[PDB]
Design an enzyme around this catalytic site. Structure first.
Site, PDB file in Angstrom:
ATOM      1  N   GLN C  11       0.827  -1.197   0.000  1.00 56.43           N
ATOM      2  CA  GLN C  11       0.000   0.000   0.000  1.00 56.43           C
ATOM      3  C   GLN C  11       0.863   1.249   0.000  1.00 56.43           C
ATOM      4  OE1 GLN C  11      -2.562   0.555   3.349  1.00 56.43           O
ATOM      5  NE2 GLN C  11      -4.012   1.802   2.183  1.00 56.43           N
ATOM      6  N   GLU C  62      -4.248  -7.369  -1.671  1.00 57.34           N
ATOM      7  CA  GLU C  62      -5.475  -6.874  -1.058  1.00 57.34           C
ATOM      8  C   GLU C  62      -6.109  -5.802  -1.937  1.00 57.34           C
ATOM      9  OE1 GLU C  62      -7.015  -8.083   1.514  1.00 57.34           O
ATOM     10  OE2 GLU C  62      -8.606  -6.592   1.515  1.00 57.34           O
ATOM     11  N   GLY C 135       3.492  -6.782   5.116  1.00 58.44           N
ATOM     12  CA  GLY C 135       3.554  -8.209   4.846  1.00 58.44           C
ATOM     13  C   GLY C 135       3.587  -8.540   3.368  1.00 58.44           C
ATOM     14  N   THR C 136       2.812  -7.813   2.561  1.00 54.76           N
ATOM     15  CA  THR C 136       2.868  -8.035   1.120  1.00 54.76           C
ATOM     16  C   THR C 136       3.930  -7.154   0.475  1.00 54.76           C
ATOM     17  OG1 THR C 136       1.591  -7.950  -0.937  1.00 54.76           O
ATOM     18  CG2 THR C 136       0.975  -6.417   0.811  1.00 54.76           C
ATOM     19  N   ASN C 197       9.728   7.161   7.870  1.00 53.35           N
ATOM     20  CA  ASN C 197       8.509   7.919   8.099  1.00 53.35           C
ATOM     21  C   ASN C 197       8.785   9.131   8.978  1.00 53.35           C
ATOM     22  OD1 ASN C 197       7.285   5.671   6.754  1.00 53.35           O
ATOM     23  ND2 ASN C 197       5.370   6.146   7.826  1.00 53.35           N
ATOM     24  N   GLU C 245      24.411   4.608 -13.805  1.00 49.60           N
ATOM     25  CA  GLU C 245      25.447   5.431 -13.203  1.00 49.60           C
ATOM     26  C   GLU C 245      25.258   5.723 -11.720  1.00 49.60           C
ATOM     27  OE1 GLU C 245      28.054   5.665 -14.786  1.00 49.60           O
ATOM     28  OE2 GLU C 245      29.160   7.471 -14.326  1.00 49.60           O
TER      29      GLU C 245
HETATM   30  N1  LIG Z   1       7.068   6.362   3.404  1.00 49.11           N
HETATM   31  C1  LIG Z   1       5.838   5.858   3.462  1.00 49.11           C
HETATM   32  N2  LIG Z   1       5.606   4.684   4.148  1.00 49.11           N
HETATM   33  C2  LIG Z   1       4.356   4.166   4.215  1.00 49.11           C
HETATM   34  C3  LIG Z   1       3.299   4.801   3.588  1.00 49.11           C
HETATM   35  N3  LIG Z   1       2.187   4.072   3.818  1.00 49.11           N
HETATM   36  C4  LIG Z   1       2.513   2.991   4.560  1.00 49.11           C
HETATM   37  N4  LIG Z   1       3.855   3.041   4.821  1.00 49.11           N
HETATM   38  C5  LIG Z   1       4.650   2.063   5.582  1.00 49.11           C
HETATM   39  O1  LIG Z   1       4.224   0.744   5.298  1.00 49.11           O
HETATM   40  C6  LIG Z   1       4.419  -0.070   6.434  1.00 49.11           C
HETATM   41  C7  LIG Z   1       3.419  -1.218   6.477  1.00 49.11           C
HETATM   42  O2  LIG Z   1       3.009  -1.594   5.180  1.00 49.11           O
HETATM   43  P1  LIG Z   1       1.607  -1.039   4.634  1.00 49.11           P
HETATM   44  O3  LIG Z   1       1.837   0.024   3.588  1.00 49.11           O
HETATM   45  O4  LIG Z   1       0.810  -0.500   5.795  1.00 49.11           O
HETATM   46  O5  LIG Z   1       0.839  -2.300   4.000  1.00 49.11           O
HETATM   47  P2  LIG Z   1       1.467  -3.167   2.804  1.00 49.11           P
HETATM   48  O6  LIG Z   1       2.736  -2.540   2.281  1.00 49.11           O
HETATM   49  O7  LIG Z   1       0.421  -3.356   1.739  1.00 49.11           O
HETATM   50  O8  LIG Z   1       1.730  -4.608   3.446  1.00 49.11           O
HETATM   51  P3  LIG Z   1       0.578  -5.202   4.389  1.00 49.11           P
HETATM   52  O9  LIG Z   1       0.782  -4.623   5.766  1.00 49.11           O
HETATM   53  O10 LIG Z   1       0.652  -6.708   4.427  1.00 49.11           O
HETATM   54  O11 LIG Z   1      -0.774  -4.780   3.869  1.00 49.11           O
HETATM   55  C8  LIG Z   1       4.249   0.857   7.620  1.00 49.11           C
HETATM   56  O12 LIG Z   1       5.196   0.560   8.618  1.00 49.11           O
HETATM   57  C9  LIG Z   1       4.477   2.253   7.079  1.00 49.11           C
HETATM   58  O13 LIG Z   1       5.646   2.808   7.636  1.00 49.11           O
HETATM   59  C10 LIG Z   1       3.527   5.984   2.894  1.00 49.11           C
HETATM   60  O14 LIG Z   1       2.600   6.568   2.339  1.00 49.11           O
HETATM   61  N5  LIG Z   1       4.799   6.511   2.836  1.00 49.11           N
HETATM   62 MG   LIG Z   2      -4.711  -3.011  -1.234  1.00 52.81          MG
END
Ligand SMILES: Nc1nc2c(ncn2[C@@H]2O[C@H](COP(=O)(O)OP(=O)(O)OP(=O)(O)O)[C@@H](O)[C@H]2O)c(=O)[nH]1
Ligand SMILES: [Mg+2]
Ligand SMILES: Nc1nc2c(ncn2[C@@H]2O[C@H](COP(=O)(O)OP(=O)(O)O)[C@@H](O)[C@H]2O)c(=O)[nH]1
Ligand SMILES: Nc1nc2c(ncn2[C@@H]2O[C@H](COP(=O)(O)OP(=O)(O)O)[C@@H](O)[C@H]2O)c(=O)[nH]1
Lengths: 426, 161, 428, 48, 31, 35, 22, 426
Positions: C11, C62, C135-136, C197, C245
């Site tokens: 996500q 998802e 997780g994904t 973050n 590069e």
């Molecule tokens: N830099 C940045 N990090 C993000 C952002 N959105 C989510 N994250 C990071 O993503 C981590 C968790 O993954 P998620 O994006 O919530 O979900 P996912 O990547 O689809 O993996 P799942 O948790 O299994 O759904 C969190 O610890 C956040 O720090 C964003 O917009 N910018």
């Molecule tokens: Mg999704």
């Protein structure tokens, strides 16, 4: 293929489910006839999570109303938002449990379990596959606990890799109707601890205490209590049906909260909650919402979190808020309540943001947290059990239906093993 | 196009100005209610913002046109006396044209029309030449940065040119 | 001719690139329906007459956010087949995102990869946009990279990993996901860009001075720092730097390719009325610990190699003056095994801005890109985070029940420990 | 009745008595992606 | 009973706490 | 059965719906994205 | 396998909204 | 910015704090519904020092209204400027202190101080950085002294570094209602001397004296007396909320007056205070304002200034004036009155200027004075305390609920230690 099949277990499960389906039908803009309204595309955008098509453009709920006595199922049918269910979803019992575990589990269970599983299969493979089930039940009565958890005991081996989300209403400490309270309580827990994937405890006297000292209503009917709990699982499953910038599922809560497979008993918060003079005078913001949320008197399980350690927690937000006020007010709570959490996990609690709030809500939080503070009730059920089991009384009502001694002794052996299990994680 | 008619703009000293008067000035619409408690907390800060930045100025830099959300002639003039800049009379057709144009109304929604959002009181919408929203100053929004979002005014690139 | 394929998983990956491809189409002037009212060919393919199709693929397990992009504003420029919906989320599990439910999506995604790369010759790189904590993001994020190293083993897989903050992690099993995916990400990527973050949260508070950011405000800054990295690709400049590069002048050993970024200026409209955006000060304003993207203090670190590429009307004369200013500074103590440590990339294109975002405009945008030995501390806090949770095997029954056997938790301990000691033996 | 801290929303359901009059349905969308990225009219279009 | 809590009674604030006098005597309200 | 208005709305929990609403001006949503 | 309206996006829906607008 | 958390303790504290919130509300132009008027920048830019935004454009006071009998705050809500306060912020008692220190401190105040602390940290934690806690109470009343000073002592160990300023009103010798006067006064000072950073003392007979001799007021009422104290109650905080050419803060006054930490008791005064026939005949200028400043009848504390030496003093002016007529009028009063000032400190006078006058007044000033001649109230409270103690009178109402005999003896030992400490600094 994202569905949650609802199961209504016993009389308590029927009212708490009827109020829950009402507060999610009008959340999703649904006529009690079954048509769609609501002036927002989000409401039908994810509608198959709880519903199905009725081959006329009508929406029918995916729930199984179940009880052993037809009076309470006539009451939810004659009531509003009761004509939504198709008549074949209701399953009738005639004899009725006499508030006995052995009566509901063994004698008339086998003549209704053949039917109540045939109706929950047809909802299950109505689609190709799903994620799991949710049930609502109580541990005080006979039909609310007996085949309420035996239904779990058959679907556990039917669908093994599916989430088994159970809402259990526990017997109250200070007040007790249905005088065999711990007999239904301990004999249900001793198989629910390994056949239920994730369980939430709902305490009656916790609910009256919330509605008296922080919601300030004077004479709480059971319908008033029904709405306060209906908003709890309207939030925990809200992101399954609605978008957000931090997506979350019930399996997401399950992996982030359950460290070890034995221990899955969860406490619930719902905030904000004010009275008629305090709605206008109280601000609505994230730092005050979370700080009011981390209170003992908000908690609908009134085992004091001050007398225990939060092993882990979780907050799902609902509304138009950002993410970092969820984040640094998480860590602000983390360092302020440094001894109230557990030391070997920094950043104990997970969090989530969902875009839509409930109707007329700015920001709302449902708080699913796993705490070891909950021993004040599980040793309370255990020593209320051993007060009556030692004297043998009120057990000859159970012997002739299949109960025997070594299943009884296995009940407290699984009970005090779990009580001592949480003590050593402290 | 001609956004306003000849007899619509209305300032202090009780005289009308035409549309070419706004040439080269940062033009903004003040959707606000007289009795609204948001507006009570926000109007003094707009009064100081209008004060210092154009009084200590080389040319006229800011005009704010009040466009009213009130309920009465007498309530309109009472809020008028506490405020010096431009405005629009309430019972011309103009108030309900820029209301639906800029999505700024006050939960009276279904008894008039079936659209969605409202983004109501309070708001300042600094605008361009052709009636376009130029940028949003977030008093009450997702930012909800009330009483401070006036510093986010981008006055160099928003001109009524 | 010239092309780069962008991949987004998780996500975080989908909404980061939701701001990247917004900023890309804003650069080329194309309306976001795909219609324009030869330099865009590295990001977009031409399909017919005046129709622009992105070179992006959207991946998750998802479907609540791939369908939100599909029904969103960019329904027609984003052709509906680049997006892929999953069945169910990996649910904060590497084991679910890689072993059990990732097999039904990796086959479709790779069938997309070689049918998007066989269109024209001259494929140049991949922009992998993943979240290590998710997780994904780490599960399907991992599973795509070894399969991309098998078929396209002689190409560049550049990565953008959002490392978690020491305090802000928004997940409990998050450090379990980070340790167990970095080792498998290690020898399958070749350039790694670690952001954070809380670091960009501190940036938005300090110099862009919003009290109130959100994930999309995170996404404006990361879309800007990727765009400045790809500025010399799409458009013309004096000293153009390409994908082949960025690794030429940062990675000295094949093991050490993890690396920080920053950006300057990050200002508002009221923050540009009053000061020099001169070349002699932007480099200073991009080197302080209050400016990078990982909240990793380099004052006890040691700078090693850095690209300092520019965009706008800028001359390499005062660029050369700013370089000698840094080298004469004593606080930024460079390593002794290379007296030279800089590249100065340069490009003529004015820094684009999004109308609506708070990042105001300037005729000079500077992305600082830096490899440093300071990574030892940001991975050491990551190591003792795992050691405290692994004391009595916490949260491991979820992973072993998915089919990932007990025992490949454990070499992930000493593989990251072997990576941690690599920073000490290169800084001696 | 705005000024006296209006506490009910049932006034918005008075007009749609059949709730099928084609006026209110499909009129709003409340996701964060449209809060950040959505402009004047290129959101709801037919596909040619 | 069915309504919300009555929190506060009817309370006639008589001249014991009906201040005035020194109100205008300190606020300079002119003769 | 005492089928009066306050009895029926109490048992149906309509009062808890009243207090759980937020009594001020509600739905805010502006699109900050410019063309 | 349940079949919903085209405004509910289950299974193929982009290539189901366009041939039959429902 | 910086936050002041007001607490109104006892029946006295609730009434004098209600007039404080009225005199600061009209000072900020706040409509009694909660909204704003006056269209000025300078007022609302610093209103967070005493108010909080309640997401509806209304400003809720940061006031904790409490005592053990509900009959006091039931009257302040029905009075004007009473609905500004939050109703859940009000914390109630039911039994009421029986006009004593002991039933306040120990028995009926222990179970209420839990909820009192919770709403104090509700207000304190909700802001970024806090300046100090401010408490108005009485040292003669049962609930104003019993658990009022327990609230002072118990907030110290969690918040020791924020300033601790209190207004305390003492019993009067010549008019003695509230029959146990010295038992509440002596036995509360011995605890308020080590758990409070700064205490200001008020005597009701002195507030009566300013009504007759200065104002020529015919019939003074209790609400009038609360406006006399509220004038310098807001005057001590003028520059905390408003700009100034020479600032003053609560820690500014604390550090610059008391030379020794155990000495923290002050006099107070408010100028100008004219009469019915002397508005337009009396000049309002700094030279005359300092002459009414150092007037024995002007003082709102009945401890005589000219019977001893002024250790230090402070004069915080309000309005538009030249600040070196503030300065030289501090110089020359030390010049003509050398015996009335202490000799081992040159320049006893601290002065500062707040630029915002009170409404309708061109110019005003407040006294924050520090005299060693506060002894005539200390020995007068002490010798009636020992008068009833040596014949063991009215001790059965105190010792019957878990008190030893040695608490009175150490209260007297602290009391005459204060007498001996102040007398040797003549
Ligand atoms: N830099 C940045 N990090 C993000 C952002 N959105 C989510 N994250 C990071 O993503 C981590 C968790 O993954 P998620 O994006 O919530 O979900 P996912 O990547 O689809 O993996 P799942 O948790 O299994 O759904 C969190 O610890 C956040 O720090 C964003 O917009 N910018
Ligand atoms: Mg999704
Ligand atoms: N449904 C309902 N349950 C209640 C009420 N009051 C208490 N309870 C709880 O419900 C339990 C009663 O058991 P129940 O499930 O209704 O009996 P059953 O229908 O025979 O299984 C008790 O343990 C109480 O704690 C009420 O008014 N309605
Ligand atoms: N300043 C002031 N003093 C008061 C007021 N009411 C009573 N007093 C004085 O304080 C004493 C009453 O004690 P009090 O603190 O009210 O007892 P409580 O009810 O336990 O708080 C009396 O002797 C009065 O002289 C008031 O409203 N203002």
């Amino acid at each position: 293929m994202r569905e949650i099949v609802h199961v209504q277990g016993g009389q308590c499960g029927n009212q708490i489910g009827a109020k829950f389906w009402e507060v999610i039908s009008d959340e999703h803009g649904i006529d009690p006839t079954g048509t769609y309204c609501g002036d927002s595309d989000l409401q039908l955008e994810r509608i198959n999570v709880f519903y199905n098509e009725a081959t006329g453009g009508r929406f029918v709920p995916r729930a199984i109303l179940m009880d052993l006595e037809p009076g309470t199922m006539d009451s939810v049918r004659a009531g509003p938002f009761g004509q939504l269910f198709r008549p074949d979803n209701f399953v009738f019992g005639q004899t009725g449990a006499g508030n006995n575990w052995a009566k509901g589990h063994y004698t008339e269970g086998a003549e209704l379990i053949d039917s109540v599983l045939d109706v929950v299969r047809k909802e299950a493979e109505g689609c190709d596959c799903l994620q799991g089930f949710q049930i609502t039940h109580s541990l005080g009565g006979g039909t609310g606990s007996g085949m309420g958890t035996l239904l779990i005991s058959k679907v556990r081996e039917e669908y093994p890799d599916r989430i088994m989300e159970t809402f259990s209403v526990f017997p109250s400490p200070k007040v007790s109707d249905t005088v065999v309270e711990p007999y239904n309580a301990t004999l249900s827990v001793h198989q629910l601890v390994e056949n239920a994937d994730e369980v939430q405890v709902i305490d009656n006297e916790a609910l009256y205490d919330i509605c008296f000292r922080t919601l300030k209503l004077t004479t709480p009917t059971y319908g008033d209590l029904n709405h306060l709990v209906s908003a709890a699982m309207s939030g925990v499953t809200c992101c399954l049906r609605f978008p957000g910038q931090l997506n979350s599922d019930l399996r997401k809560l399950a992996v982030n909260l359950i460290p070890f497979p034995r221990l899955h008993f969860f406490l619930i918060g719902f905030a904000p909650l004010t009275s008629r003079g305090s709605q206008q005078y109280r601000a609505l913001s994230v730092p005050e919402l979370t700080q009011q949320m981390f209170d003992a008197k908000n908690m609908m399980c009134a085992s004091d979190p001050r007398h225990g350690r939060y092993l882990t927690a979780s907050a799902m937000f609902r509304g138009r808020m950002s993410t970092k006020e969820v984040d640094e007010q998480m860590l602000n709570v983390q360092n302020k309540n440094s001894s109230y959490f557990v030391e070997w996990i920094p950043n104990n609690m997970k969090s989530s943001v969902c875009d839509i709030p409930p109707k007329g809500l700015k920001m709302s939080v449902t708080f699913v947290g796993n705490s070891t503070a909950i021993q004040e009730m599980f040793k309370r059920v255990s020593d209320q059990f051993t007060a009556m089991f030692r004297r043998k009384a009120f057990l000859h009502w159970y012997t002739g239906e299949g109960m025997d001694e070594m299943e009884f002794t296995e009940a407290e052996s699984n009970m005090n093993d779990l009580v001592s299990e949480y003590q050593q994680y402290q | 196009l001609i956004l306003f008619p000849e007899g619509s703009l209305k300032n202090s000293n009780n005289t009308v100005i035409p549309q070419s008067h706004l040439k080269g000035k940062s033009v903004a619409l003040y959707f606000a209610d007289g009795a609204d408690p948001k507006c009570a907390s926000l109007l003094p800060f707009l009064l100081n913002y209008y004060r210092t930045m154009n009084e200590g100025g080389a040319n006229q830099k800011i005009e704010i046109i009040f466009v009213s959300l009130d309920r009465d002639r007498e309530a309109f003039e009472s809020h008028r006396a506490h405020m010096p800049w431009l405005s629009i009379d309430l019972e011309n057709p103009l108030t309900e044209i820029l209301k639906r144009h800029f999505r700024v109304m006050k939960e009276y929604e279904v008894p008039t029309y079936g659209y969605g959002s409202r983004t109501g009181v309070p708001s300042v919408i600094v605008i361009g030449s052709d009636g376009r929203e130029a940028q949003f100053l977030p008093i009450c929004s997702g930012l909800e940065e009330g009483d401070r979002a006036l510093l986010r005014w981008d006055w160099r690139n928003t001109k009524f040119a | 001719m010239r092309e780069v394929i962008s991949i987004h998983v998780g996500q975080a990956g989908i909404q980061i690139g939701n701001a990247c491809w917004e900023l890309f189409c804003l650069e080329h002037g194309i309306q976001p329906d795909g219609q324009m009212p030869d330099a865009f060919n590295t990001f977009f393919s031409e399909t017919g007459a005046g129709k622009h199709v992105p070179r992006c693929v959207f991946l998750d397990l998802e479907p609540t956010v791939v369908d939100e992009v599909r029904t969103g504003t960019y329904r027609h420029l984003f052709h509906p087949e680049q997006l892929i919906s999953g069945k169910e989320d990996a649910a904060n599990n590497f084991a679910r995102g890689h072993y059990t439910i990732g097999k039904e999506i990796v086959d479709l995604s790779l069938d997309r990869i070689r049918k998007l790369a066989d269109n024209c010759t001259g494929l140049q790189g991949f922009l992998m946009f993943n979240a290590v904590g998710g997780g994904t993001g780490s599960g399907l994020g991992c599973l795509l990279l070894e399969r991309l190293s098998v078929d396209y083993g002689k190409k560049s897989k550049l990565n953008f990993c959002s490392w978690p903050s020491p305090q802000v992690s928004t997940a409990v099993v998050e450090p379990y996901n980070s340790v167990l995916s970095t080792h498998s990400l290690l020898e399958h990527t070749d350039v790694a860009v670690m952001l954070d973050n809380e670091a960009i949260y501190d940036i938005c508070r300090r110099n862009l001075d919003i009290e109130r950011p959100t994930y999309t405000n995170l996404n404006r800054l990361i879309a800007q720092v990727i765009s400045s990295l790809t500025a010399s690709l799409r458009f013309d400049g004096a000293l153009n730097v390409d994908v082949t590069e960025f690794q030429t002048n940062l990675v000295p050993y094949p093991r050490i390719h993890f690396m920080l970024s920053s950006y300057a200026p990050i200002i508002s409209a009221e923050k540009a009325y009053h000061e020099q955006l001169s070349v002699a000060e932007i480099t200073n304003s991009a080197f302080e610990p209050a400016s990078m993207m990982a909240k990793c203090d380099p004052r006890h670190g040691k700078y090693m190699a850095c690209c300092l590429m520019y965009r706008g009307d800028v001359v390499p004369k005062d660029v050369n003056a700013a370089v000698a200013t840094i080298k004469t500074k004593r606080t930024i103590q460079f390593v002794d095994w290379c007296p030279t440590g800089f590249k100065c990339g340069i490009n003529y294109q004015p820094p684009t801005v999004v109308p609506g975002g708070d990042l105001a405009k300037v005729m000079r945008a500077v992305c600082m890109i830096s490899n440093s030995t300071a990574i030892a501390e940001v991975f050491s806090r990551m190591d003792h985070k795992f050691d405290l949770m692994y004391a009595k095997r916490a949260f491991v029954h979820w992973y072993v029940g998915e089919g990932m056997e007990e025992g490949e938790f454990s070499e992930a301990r000493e593989d990251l420990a072997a990576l941690e000691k690599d920073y000490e033996e290169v800084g001696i | 009745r705005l000024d006296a801290h209006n506490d009910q929303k049932l006034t918005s359901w008075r007009i749609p008595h059949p709730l099928y009059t084609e006026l209110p349905q499909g009129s709003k969308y409340e996701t964060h992606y449209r809060q950040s990225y959505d402009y004047e009219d290129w959101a709801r279009r037919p596909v040619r | 009973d069915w309504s919300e809590k009555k929190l506060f009674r009817k309370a006639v604030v008589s001249t014991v706490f009906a201040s005035d006098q020194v109100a205008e005597r300190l606020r300079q309200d002119l003769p | 059965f005492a089928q009066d208005a306050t009895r029926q709305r109490a048992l149906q929990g309509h009062r808890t719906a009243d207090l759980l609403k937020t009594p001020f001006d509600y739905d805010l949503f502006h699109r900050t994205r410019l063309p | 396998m349940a079949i919903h309206v085209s405004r509910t996006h289950r299974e193929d829906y982009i290539r189901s909204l366009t041939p039959r607008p429902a």
